[PDB]
Amino acid sequence: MERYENLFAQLNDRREGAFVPFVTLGDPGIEQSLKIIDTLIDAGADALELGVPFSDPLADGPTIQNANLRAFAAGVTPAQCFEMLALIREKHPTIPIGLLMYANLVFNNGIDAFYARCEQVGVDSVLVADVPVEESAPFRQAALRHNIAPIFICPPNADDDLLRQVASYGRGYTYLLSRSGVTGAENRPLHHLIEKLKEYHAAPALQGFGISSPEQVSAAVRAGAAGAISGSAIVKIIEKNLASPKQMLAELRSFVSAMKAASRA
Amino acid sequence: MERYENLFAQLNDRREGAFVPFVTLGDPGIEQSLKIIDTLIDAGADALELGVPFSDPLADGPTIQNANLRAFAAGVTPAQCFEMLALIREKHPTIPIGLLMYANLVFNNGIDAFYARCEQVGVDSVLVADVPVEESAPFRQAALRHNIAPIFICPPNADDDLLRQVASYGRGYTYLLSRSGVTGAENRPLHHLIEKLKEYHAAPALQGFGISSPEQVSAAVRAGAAGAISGSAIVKIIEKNLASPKQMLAELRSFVSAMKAASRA
Amino acid sequence: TTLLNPYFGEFGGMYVPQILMPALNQLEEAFVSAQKDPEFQAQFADLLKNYAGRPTALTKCQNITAGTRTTLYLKREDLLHGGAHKTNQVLGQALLAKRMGKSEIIAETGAGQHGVASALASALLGLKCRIYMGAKDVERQSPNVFRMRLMGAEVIPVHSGSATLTDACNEALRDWSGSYETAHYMLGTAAGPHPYPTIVREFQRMIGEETKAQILDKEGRLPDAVIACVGGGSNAIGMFADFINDTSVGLIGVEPGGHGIETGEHGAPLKHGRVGIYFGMKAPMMQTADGQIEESYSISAGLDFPSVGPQHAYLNSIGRADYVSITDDEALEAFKTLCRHEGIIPALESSHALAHALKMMREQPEKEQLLVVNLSGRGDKDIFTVHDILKARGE
Amino acid sequence: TTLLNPYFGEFGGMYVPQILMPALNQLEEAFVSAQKDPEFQAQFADLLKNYAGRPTALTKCQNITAGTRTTLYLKREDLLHGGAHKTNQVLGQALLAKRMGKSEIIAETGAGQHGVASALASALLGLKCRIYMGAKDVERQSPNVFRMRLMGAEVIPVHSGSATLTDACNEALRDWSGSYETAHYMLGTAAGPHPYPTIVREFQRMIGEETKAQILDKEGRLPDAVIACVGGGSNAIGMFADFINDTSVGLIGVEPGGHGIETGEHGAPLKHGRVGIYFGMKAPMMQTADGQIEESYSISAGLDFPSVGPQHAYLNSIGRADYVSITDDEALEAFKTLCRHEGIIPALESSHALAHALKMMREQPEKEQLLVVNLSGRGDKDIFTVHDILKARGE
Numbered sequence A, B: 001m002e003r004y005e006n007l008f009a010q011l012n013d014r015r016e017g018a019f020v021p022f023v024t025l026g027d028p029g030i031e032q033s034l035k036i037i038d039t040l041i042d043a044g045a046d047a048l049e050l051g052v053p054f055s056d057p058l059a060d061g062p063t064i065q066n067a068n069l070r071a072f073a074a075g076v077t078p079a080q081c082f083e084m085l086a087l088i089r090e091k092h093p094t095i096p097i098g099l100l101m102y103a104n105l106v107f108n109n110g111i112d113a114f115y116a117r118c119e120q121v122g123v124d125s126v127l128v129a130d131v132p133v134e135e136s137a138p139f140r141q142a143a144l145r146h147n148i149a150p151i152f153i154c155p156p157n158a159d160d161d162l163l164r165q166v167a168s169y170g171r172g173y174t175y176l177l178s179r180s181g182v183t184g185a186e187n188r189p190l191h192h193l194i195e196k197l198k199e200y201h202a203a204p205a206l207q208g209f210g211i212s213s214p215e216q217v218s219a220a221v222r223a224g225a226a227g228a229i230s231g232s233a234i235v236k237i238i239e240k241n242l243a244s245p246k247q248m249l250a251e252l253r254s255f256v257s258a259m260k261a262a263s264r265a
Numbered sequence C, D: 001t002t003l004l005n006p007y008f009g010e011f012g013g014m015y016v017p018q019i020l021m022p023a024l025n026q027l028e029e030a031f032v033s034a035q036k037d038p039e040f041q042a043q044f045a046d047l048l049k050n051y052a053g054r055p056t057a058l059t060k061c062q063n064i065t066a067g068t069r070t071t072l073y074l075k076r077e078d079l080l081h082g083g084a085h086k087t088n089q090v091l092g093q094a095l096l097a098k099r100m101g102k103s104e105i106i107a108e109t110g111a112g113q114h115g116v117a118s119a120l121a122s123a124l125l126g127l128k129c130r131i132y133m134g135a136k137d138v139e140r141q142s143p144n145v146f147r148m149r150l151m152g153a154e155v156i157p158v159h160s161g162s163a164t165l166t167d168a169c170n171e172a173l174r175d176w177s178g179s180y181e182t183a184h185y186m187l188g189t190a191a192g193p194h195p196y197p198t199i200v201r202e203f204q205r206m207i208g209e210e211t212k213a214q215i216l217d218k219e220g221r222l223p224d225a226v227i228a229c230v231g232g233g234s235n236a237i238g239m240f241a242d243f244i245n246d247t248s249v250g251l252i253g254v255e256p257g258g259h260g261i262e263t264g265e266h267g268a269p270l271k272h273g274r275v276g277i278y279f280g281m282k283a284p285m286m287q288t289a290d291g292q293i294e295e296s297y298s299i300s301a302g303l304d305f306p307s308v309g310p311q312h313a314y315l316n317s318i319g320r321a322d323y324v325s326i327t328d329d330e331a332l333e334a335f336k337t338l339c340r341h342e343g344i345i346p347a348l349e350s351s352h353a354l355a356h357a358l359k360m361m362r363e364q365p366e367k368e369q370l371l372v373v374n375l376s377g378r379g380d381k382d383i384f385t386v387h388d389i390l391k392a393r394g395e
């Protein structure tokens, strides 16, 4: 989790927020995915959120559902994802890497064994989308034993008990949820939540769910949050250019450049 | 009813039974029907049973159902039937004429008025197929007031009460029912019934329902009954020759000749 | 002679060929004997309760009477096993058939609810069952055709005449006249020759008996009126019977108006026909001036019949019961209203009864009245017919 | 924290995104409060009796056990309004929704019986109702699609995945995660995140409570075993619940065997899957070696689900309840047997329960045993699917 600590320190000494794109590993194929992610990092991604293809992504709308399907159409397995993660980490030693998991893929071969493999390939954090703080104990204990930060969601209408729980249980960053619903660039902050998290010594906040334009990025940083995550806007650029691999990459680099720039105050 | 009395007297003084064909009036048209009936009488019919087209002939199988339909296809009404009956009677002053009615056509304009019209055109008897002896009182009273014989069915398994009722209530002839079921030449006597009817002074017996060959005719006469009725066998000769009117009549005359002959002992 | 009166005033009788009279007398004595037999009655009650599900609920409508002074209850025969009230008397007739040593069943059907009931009782009680149904009705009520065949019944489409209920009735009776020593004719309504109108009423009178007890328990008084559709008369006389001597209770029977009485395409002989003799009985008939039996029409196969049972003709004549009509369009609107505002999908036959009750409410919405509708069946057999209509009219 | 235990041994829990936890806690307290509320219980009882038709009959089979020492009763949930047991708990959840001030309903359905129940309760009680259903199930259970739309519900076909129940479940939950302040998610079975497995059991436990009283009255003793099909678990836990402390009574749940367990085309995760986390719960799942949720198969849409409710996984683990499977062909043979020999057309889901009881009888025909089958629904929705099979195999 130290990579998150060091990134937020340097972003503080530069007066700017983090831009954190999301992609599903192996979309649309393994080799193109690795190339996409390098292009994201070259265009200015501060950290990564990476999805492992899951058969039933409950928290994802159609854009990221179709990403998962494309990956499965390329035969992408969790095992291949861990080989990709090792190749990304080998190229990028300081970039924080976070996984977006569903619980069955963590629980499947053993929770401890999952986090042990994450540590082996150099993953820094793991967010399990369908595990609330109320069920999190064996996941966050296994995460910490393997130096993985467990990421917790702070939802829009959280009470004080949730705020204090998420502050004490999480590491790396706090996931500031923009709204109810599922992921998507078609459906578009709360300053009070950002400030209560600081009082309780929570990990720094990143806003996600619905961020698709530079303006939304600048808004989050100004609200005092530490940065912002965009999945679907990234993914649709992939979807629209499946037949033009290098037109895809050019459009990805242009988009990420604009989103990154918006985080600079 | 006197015409029945005189016919059975002369058939007695000749040692032979009666052959009584049935047709529906107006099948397949009025003019062809009148011609058919004259051919029946010329070929040796002793008396006639004549059906008035009814919308729902409950006691008739498909052969005579289709006769009724043909008549309706020619626009034949009960009124036209009474005009036909008057033309038949005018040509044939001694031939007993019996009607096969369904109750609604008798009840429709008034039971008394129906029997009054029968008397006016010279009808000798009326059998109402769906009126049992238990409901017959207003029909048989109106029949007798207009010198019409009411015909009653003696069914195969009749009890003694029925035998005595039918003996006392009927006139003209007693209808000896061959079997259960509906009319038809596809589904083919009881000597005990024939003899109990004589003891009670019933009108003479004619057997019907299923008689289609000369052998059946000879069998009835030998059993001591006074004769036999054939509807469907007659009707099918009509049905089969609709496109050949005079081939129809030739086949009708040949058939009736053979049936009549079988009644001669 | 008979043991019981075959007439209701001038209406009724036994207008069948002489060959069938022993069968009718045989059925009458078996019924009279069964009605005095505690063991018969206990067996019949056992089948009603534990097999068919009686007593049926009496449901108070909430939504559809809002803003009026009408309180409307629905007697839920749609919940009976088989989906309609036809099952009640079929169980009783099937026990009579066994009591007579019969082994086969003949039946006619139009909505196919009586056919389904005849098939299920024959499967349960070990009878062999064959059913006549008009070819038009084979189509517009086809769910029930499958249902009867799945239970082992033989289903014979009748293509003569209208290919509707009259022609199935005719074919049934033709068959029985040649198979009555071994088959019992399970007539499906309170019409036909005596003793059927009497037997069918007595074997359906639990509809009204339960309704009376249920209303007294929930409301502490009798209803102002009970309302039922009239196809041949069985669910209406089953609802009426126990109220006949309660002279304050209105009895309202609803005939199909079809496309409108003035078009002549309807099924309302009691109020728009004239007395005649057919289907073994003297009763109001749709007929031509010449006495030919007319073809009826109704959107609802179960009401599409050109006559009516003789006890209804009698109750009308003396003014004890009143009869009205409801058109195809009115029945369809009440069908939609019940689905959407009470969550119950009624048979289109029962929808005619509902439509008239809704008229009674809507025409006089400040009139205080406690009404019961006989909800004689559920509408699963009608959803395909209804869907093709709503699509033809752009919905 | 919760007011009630969310687990049955290791199984159950609340594995939903953090955003949905307030909704689940809100539902739990409303349920706990309703269960202590005499007025809630009287309103729920009133709807069960007078609207849905409870108590349902307990029918003794005569014909199908002849020549054996098995006595077989059928608990007739097929007679409930709507045609299946799904209506019971829907009425209770709808009253909870009103208690929470909700005005919309979300629901998933496969056989379309829960969808029909959700639509009819929403029509009756004034809720706006939308229903997700797999496009495959739209077709093989199409009578119910019409039925839901006739009652004013919106029906959304789901074409992703298998186009069966899992994908409708997913779509339902996706929707609720963004509409929960105004919509109540009317989950259709005793599975999903706490408190649904508990709520659904308590709102279905009248199945077993009535069965116990009825058996005691007719037989003077408890049954040797009660037998129910298991799609997600609601009719089986509703039948089981009141017998759990009667340790002499066997509890037998029947999973779909589909084309045969060995083909992998089945719906039997409790006995042939392995524990996993999905649909908000820790429960036996059909899954790949990698943890991907497998597609299930059953001829019966209502059983075609790759998981099972957590109380059944627990009752199995401790040996209190036993679970078996029945193939498509075995269910079809029991379907035919019931139609032809008892005159009842069962749902293909319930036919799996019947098939296992008939096996219990046939395998050991001199064994004395008193059995109850939960006949969870009627088969009108299945007659077209069944007809196309019998024609494909030349019948």
Ligand SMILES: Cc1ncc(COP(=O)(O)O)c(C/N=C(\CNc2ccccc2O)C(=O)O)c1O
Pocket: C083, C084, C085, C086, C108, C109, C110, C111, C112, C113, C114, C115, C165, C187, C188, C189, C190, C191, C229, C230, C231, C232, C233, C234, C235, C236, C301, C302, C303, C305, C347, C349, C350, C376, C377, C378
């Ligand atoms: C749900 C429902 N509700 C009301 C009715 C009307 O019948 P009623 O209660 O007897 O008036 C039907 C009529 N159903 C018929 C016609 N049965 C029929 C009708 C007329 C003559 C002979 C018949 O067998 C059938 O064959 O199923 C029905 O299905």
Ligand SMILES: Cc1ncc(COP(=O)(O)O)c(C/N=C(\CNc2ccccc2O)C(=O)O)c1O
Pocket: D083, D084, D085, D086, D108, D109, D110, D111, D112, D113, D114, D115, D165, D187, D188, D189, D190, D191, D229, D230, D231, D232, D233, D234, D235, D236, D301, D302, D303, D305, D347, D349, D350, D376, D377, D378
């Ligand atoms: C007559 C009948 N009998 C038994 C069943 C089996 O369901 P059970 O009693 O809950 O085990 C059904 C299942 N029906 C479903 C699936 N309902 C469903 C199944 C699994 C997960 C979510 C669901 O909504 C429906 O949507 O109607 C049924 O219709």
Ligand SMILES: O=P(O)(O)OCCNS(=O)(=O)c1ccc(OC(F)(F)F)cc1
Pocket: A022, A049, A050, A051, A059, A060, A064, A100, A127, A128, A129, A130, A153, A177, A182, A183, A184, A185, A208, A209, A210, A211, A212, A229, A230, A231, A232, A233, D017, D018
């Ligand atoms: O920009 P969008 O709309 O595409 O959203 C991108 C989200 N990708 S993610 O990994 O951060 C992410 C984070 C949390 C999720 O579910 C949970 F909140 F329930 F935990 C799902 C996805």
Ligand SMILES: O=P(O)(O)OCCNS(=O)(=O)c1ccc(OC(F)(F)F)cc1
Pocket: B022, B049, B050, B051, B059, B060, B064, B100, B127, B128, B129, B130, B153, B177, B182, B183, B184, B185, B208, B209, B210, B211, B212, B229, B230, B231, B232, B233, C017, C018
């Ligand atoms: O030879 P078939 O088979 O065609 O029978 C011919 C019968 N024609 S009929 O007028 O005598 C005749 C006589 C009685 C009938 O019904 C009743 F017995 F109920 F009264 C029907 C027709």
Ligand SMILES: [Cl-]
Pocket: A041, A042, A043, A044, A045, A046
């Ligand atoms: Cl960078």
Ligand SMILES: [Cl-]
Pocket: A167, A168, A169, A170, A171, A201, A202, A203
């Ligand atoms: Cl912390």
Ligand SMILES: [Cl-]
Pocket: B041, B042, B043, B044, B045, B046
């Ligand atoms: Cl001559």
Ligand SMILES: [Cl-]
Pocket: B167, B168, B169, B170, B171, B201, B202, B203
């Ligand atoms: Cl005489």
Ligand SMILES: [Cl-]
Pocket: C007, C010
């Ligand atoms: Cl009289």
Ligand SMILES: [Cl-]
Pocket: C035, C036, C041
């Ligand atoms: Cl009695």
Ligand SMILES: [Cl-]
Pocket: C035, C036, C037, C038, C041
């Ligand atoms: Cl008695």
Ligand SMILES: [Cl-]
Pocket: none
């Ligand atoms: Cl009393």
Ligand SMILES: [Cl-]
Pocket: C217, C218, C219, C220
């Ligand atoms: Cl009161």
Ligand SMILES: [Cl-]
Pocket: C262, C263, C264
């Ligand atoms: Cl006109």
Ligand SMILES: [Cl-]
Pocket: B108, B109, C289, C290
């Ligand atoms: Cl006239």
Ligand SMILES: [Cl-]
Pocket: C323, C324, C325, C326
């Ligand atoms: Cl009117």
